RNA sequence: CUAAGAAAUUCACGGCGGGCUUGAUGUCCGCGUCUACCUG
């Protein structure tokens, strides 16, 4: 999420998460994970870059869908994207 | 000698209120008739806007009127200031035209930036621009928005043919009226986002719409001339150029890169800044407003 | 006479049935010699234990209602009366009257003591204010608190703390709770300037004061005549030769009053809050006794 | 260490009967409110 003038700072990453991140929202596959690369998990605003931490062929071959397309306007303990988090 | 007390500037590049519609893709040649989108309730309730289930492509339509006569103040208080201001704007115009500013306007016309939160999520966005001299069309254009970069400043043949038309309008040669339409394949039943009103949506003839000044804001994201950091790239031209979505305030008056200080030493002590700042001060005089003490 | 170190402030001192006459000549606010002596009694009852030293007071007078009426006659006022008990015969009493007042003030004191480091800056104001809710201060009692919101917490400011901007910030942070009163300060300067202007007709000082409050002319504020101490006329006595004294350790001097004039400022237009701490200059060299406010302007 | 120390004013009451406020009137006449704006 680059410096954009239209969307919010916490708005663009929240938009491109499950819906705009449709490959990370409805991609199909339980052999990957969306890990926060620089998400500060102590201030409640921890969206910097959700890296798709997957295997070799899972994140390299099974992640070439068009969900990453249309992102040129902005692109460039164990807790993950599951039903355990407070936002 | 000294400055002016109260100045106003009537705006130019006047947009309209964009109405919205729906329909199916590859039926967009017949886009003078489409069932318009109505606002609905959260059945505390609030109001949303959603496409019909059979339809998938949003169509946003508005008209853009270009007036021209930039440097003429609509209200002044001293002829010794006014002749200096019109002299300086005339010397700006005869050196180079509005053509760079025109292609920067036509880029924001080219990519569908006025679809604010409806641009993302789409995958085939095509605008169509008709310049009209009478009630019939006079010059057509049909772009593709996503092939053009949202930060990339290209130089096409059709976009330059549009830019010379807009520059001729800004100089005050003819009459410009662009009936801009924009088709966005968004999918079936996706949440179209119109403008927001005090908490409700914005319909005019029982059909949802964007505010006019929002499209007028989106049409003037041209400022790549930061002092700070060009990683943001373009921004909406403002005096004390500010972003409410990001809370910053670029071109601080402690720097000598704001608008008012630029105009001050540009018309009084006749200190010409760079061409990349003459572009900024003229582009701010285009949007008009209330200047002076 | 020297500088204060800590502006101990009492928050709200509701007073019931205090004195109002306070001189042979005034009848308004009670004599601030009472406020001078009240903190010396407070130091004598507390300040030896907590190891402090108190010298000056300010007054704010949050409200003041006297007890007067007019019996369908003049605009002059008669006073309140108290029924007196019967004598040995049980017939009547030679009743002698005096005024009353329901005044409500909140004084701010001045501390010089070293005992601000060993004792914390809120215990020394939680003990002093708790002591002074059990003593009299002009002839009237000091009332306790009702059951509502509570401004009964006091403060304790140090004027030595912080820089000049911090001093002028905490000064407003103290004055924000002290605003709706009217601070009263001495005005000894302009009398001995007005004298020589009024020296052509008659130089009697009581005449100069009496026509500084009586088209119409201009008064440059709210001038006010107050007692200002005591002039002495009798010489010193011995500690143990006079009959009917309150003790037998101090000498005695018969005294008459000394009338001066003051001013009822607002708390804002003062320079700082070390300008209205009522000390008492007390030269005994065949002299007199006064109580004033130096650095008044 | 205070013009400090001290203090029960109380009981009872018939305001009450009557009235003409009338008459008339010219408020006139002139006027530029502009310029802008992202509500997620």
Tab-separated table of N, CA and C (backbone and C1' of nucleotides) in Angstrom, chain B residues 9 11 211 213-214 217 220, chain D residues 34-40:
chain	number	residue	atom	x	y	z
B	9	UNK	N	-12.056	34.440	-7.472
B	9	UNK	CA	-11.852	33.898	-8.801
B	9	UNK	C	-12.952	32.901	-9.076
B	11	UNK	N	-14.714	29.924	-10.768
B	11	UNK	CA	-14.056	28.676	-11.094
B	11	UNK	C	-14.161	28.372	-12.578
B	211	UNK	N	-21.401	13.919	-5.379
B	211	UNK	CA	-21.420	15.366	-5.315
B	211	UNK	C	-20.613	15.953	-6.461
B	213	UNK	N	-18.617	18.734	-6.237
B	213	UNK	CA	-17.304	19.183	-5.805
B	213	UNK	C	-16.355	18.024	-5.558
B	214	UNK	N	-16.871	16.814	-5.339
B	214	UNK	CA	-15.992	15.656	-5.239
B	214	UNK	C	-15.382	15.319	-6.589
B	217	UNK	N	-12.887	17.791	-7.311
B	217	UNK	CA	-11.649	17.508	-6.611
B	217	UNK	C	-10.850	16.448	-7.346
B	220	UNK	N	-8.727	17.396	-10.485
B	220	UNK	CA	-7.556	18.246	-10.376
B	220	UNK	C	-6.478	17.624	-9.498
D	34	C	P	-25.640	37.288	-5.410
D	34	C	O5'	-24.693	36.282	-4.631
D	34	C	C5'	-23.649	35.589	-5.289
D	34	C	C4'	-22.420	36.448	-5.417
D	34	C	C3'	-21.094	35.724	-5.419
D	34	C	O3'	-20.799	35.176	-6.682
D	34	C	C1'	-20.978	37.635	-4.026
D	35	U	P	-20.918	33.601	-6.907
D	35	U	O5'	-19.415	33.123	-6.806
D	35	U	C5'	-18.405	33.880	-7.445
D	35	U	C4'	-17.066	33.674	-6.799
D	35	U	C3'	-16.700	32.245	-6.480
D	35	U	O3'	-16.273	31.514	-7.604
D	35	U	C1'	-16.145	33.643	-4.661
D	36	A	P	-17.104	30.226	-8.056
D	36	A	O5'	-16.177	29.013	-7.662
D	36	A	C5'	-16.441	28.271	-6.493
D	36	A	C4'	-15.204	28.148	-5.656
D	36	A	C3'	-15.048	26.840	-4.918
D	36	A	O3'	-14.520	25.821	-5.735
D	36	A	C1'	-14.691	28.611	-3.427
D	37	C	P	-15.287	24.424	-5.846
D	37	C	O5'	-14.838	23.667	-4.531
D	37	C	C5'	-13.460	23.555	-4.208
D	37	C	C4'	-13.231	23.111	-2.786
D	37	C	C3'	-13.708	21.705	-2.445
D	37	C	O3'	-12.825	21.150	-1.481
D	37	C	C1'	-14.750	23.249	-1.024
D	38	C	P	-11.809	19.982	-1.890
D	38	C	O5'	-12.760	18.736	-2.111
D	38	C	C5'	-13.606	18.297	-1.065
D	38	C	C4'	-14.420	17.123	-1.505
D	38	C	C3'	-15.295	16.517	-0.428
D	38	C	O3'	-16.418	15.905	-1.047
D	38	C	C1'	-13.630	14.966	-1.055
D	39	U	P	-17.821	15.884	-0.287
D	39	U	O5'	-17.932	14.389	0.230
D	39	U	C5'	-18.744	14.072	1.341
D	39	U	C4'	-17.929	14.043	2.598
D	39	U	C3'	-17.761	12.690	3.253
D	39	U	O3'	-16.754	11.915	2.638
D	39	U	C1'	-18.293	14.324	4.882
D	40	G	P	-17.158	10.640	1.758
D	40	G	O5'	-16.836	9.400	2.703
D	40	G	C5'	-17.191	8.078	2.321
D	40	G	C4'	-16.735	7.063	3.340
D	40	G	C3'	-17.428	7.116	4.695
D	40	G	O3'	-18.663	6.424	4.714
D	40	G	C1'	-15.099	7.062	5.019
